[PDB]
Amino acid sequence: QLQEGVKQKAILAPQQGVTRDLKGQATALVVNAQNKVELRVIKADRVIGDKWLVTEGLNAGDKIITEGLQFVQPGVEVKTVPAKNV
Amino acid sequence: TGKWEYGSPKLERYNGVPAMEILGEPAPGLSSGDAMAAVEEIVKQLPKGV
Amino acid sequence: WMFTRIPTAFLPDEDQGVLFAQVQTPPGSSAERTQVVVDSMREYLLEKES
């Protein structure tokens, strides 16, 4: 069980935030300070426990959608309530 | 090596050719033949081969 | 001009006794997210709808 490195100040997104599209890349619906939903290009490959260990697009402070990826399309003003599932 | 794709989880056919099914409802207070006419009017824009 | 007005129906609306509540979680969901939706719907339809 040899250790192969730490990633200092990493980002962990759940499966509910990271869904994929027709081209083969990964997407993640984030919100802004303007309270609009925005689709940015996330890059996730490794699953630790359950959370994706991402390397691109998301920094500290963003808020990803985890309930309601069907009711919400990118461009809709939303209100934020914290999650009910992990 | 792995690669993610995007495919359909239910492919259905109809008389030997593939299709997709809808479940339509008429307007409240309107006849069913009126809704059938108003939903066969929409088929005048589908691509050549559908 | 009284029979022209009213809409046509195939069968009247009946108090059959059952109701269907089919759900669809967002794509890429496991079974336990569907069960968390289902059992919460179940305890709502039994606790406040006794």
From Swiss-Prot, chain A:
It comes from the Bacteria. It is found in: Cell inner membrane. Disruption phenotype: Disruption of MexA, MexB and OprM significantly reduces active efflux of N-(3-oxododecanoyl) homoserine lactone/3-oxo-C12-HSL/PAI-1, but not N-butyryl homoserine lactone/C4-HSL/PAI-2. The periplasmic linker component of the MexAB-OprM efflux system that confers multidrug resistance. Functions as the major efflux pump for n-hexane and p-xylene efflux. Has been shown in one study to be involved in the active efflux of the autoinducer N-(3-oxododecanoyl) homoserine lactone, thereby playing an indirect role in quorum-sensing; but has been shown in another study not to be involved in efflux of this autoinducer. Over-expression of the pump increases antibiotic and solvent efflux capacities. Implicated in the secretion of the siderophore pyoverdine. In both X-ray crystal structures approximately the last 100 residues are not ordered. Belongs to the membrane fusion protein (MFP) (TC 8.A.1) family. This is Multidrug resistance protein MexA. The chain holds residues 281 to 366 of 383 of the full protein.
Curated annotation (Swiss-Prot), chain B:
Induction: By growth under severe iron limitation. It is found in: Cell inner membrane. Belongs to the resistance-nodulation-cell division (RND) (TC 2.A.6) family. Pyridopyrimidine derivatives, such as ABI-PP, are not exported by the MexAB-OprM efflux pump, bind tightly to a MexB hydrophobic pocket and so potentiate the activities of antibiotics such as erythromycin. The inner membrane transporter component of the MexAB-OprM efflux system that confers multidrug resistance. Functions as the major efflux pump for n-hexane and p-xylene efflux. Has been shown in one study to be involved in the active efflux of the autoinducer N-(3-oxododecanoyl) homoserine lactone, thereby playing an indirect role in quorum-sensing; but has been shown in another study not to be involved in efflux of this autoinducer. Over-expression of the pump increases antibiotic and solvent efflux capacities. Implicated in the secretion of the siderophore pyoverdine. Component of the MexAB-OprM multidrug efflux complex, composed of six MexA subunits forming a hexameric tube, binding to a MexB trimer, which interact with the trimeric OprM outer membrane channel protein. OprM is thought to not directly contact MexB; instead, MexA joins MexB and OprM by forming a funnel-like hexamer anchored to the inner membrane. MexA may initially form a hexameric ring complex with MexB prior to OprM, then OprM undergoes a conformational change as it contacts MexA, allowing the periplasmic gate to open. This is Multidrug resistance protein MexB. It comes from Pseudomonas aeruginosa (strain ATCC 15692 / DSM 22644 / CIP 104116 / JCM 14847 / LMG 12228 / 1C / PRS 101 / PAO1).
